[PDB]
Design a protein around this ligand. Structure first.
Ligand code: CA
Ligand code: CA
Length: 110
């Protein structure tokens, strides 16, 4: 039920702390620092489902700003700007949302 069950805590601590500044967020650097590239595709799918709050099968623009909080509750929200850029990068169909396969690509291209 937790990210510490899928990832190392000190990896989460250093990755989140790296983006403590605002508008600083880069998803690729983050994903490498947390160790999601070290993980299996199914463990990455486990991450996506935790980030899906409503459990629609997609991460919408409202759920995307709480990405850091999915790894660390204490973490900050992403700005509208940071969220809107991560949505541009992750949305590949123009649906305006991110599905599991799109999320898998994000992590895989990091
Ligand atoms: Ca959702
Ligand atoms: Ca999409």
């Amino acid at each position: 039920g937790s990210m510490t069950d899928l990832l190392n805590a000190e990896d989460i601590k250093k990755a989140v702390g790296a983006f403590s500044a605002t508008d600083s967020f880069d998803h690729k650097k983050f994903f490498q620092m947390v160790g999601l590239k070290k993980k299996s595709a199914d463990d990455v799918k486990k991450v996506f489902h935790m980030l899906d709050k409503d459990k629609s099968g997609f991460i919408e623009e409202d759920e995307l700003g709480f990405i850091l909080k999915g790894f660390s509750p204490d973490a900050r929200d992403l700005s509208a700007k940071e969220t809107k850029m991560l949505m541009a990068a992750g949305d590949k169909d123009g649906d305006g949302k991110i599905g599991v396969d799109e999320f898998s690509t994000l992590v895989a291209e990091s």
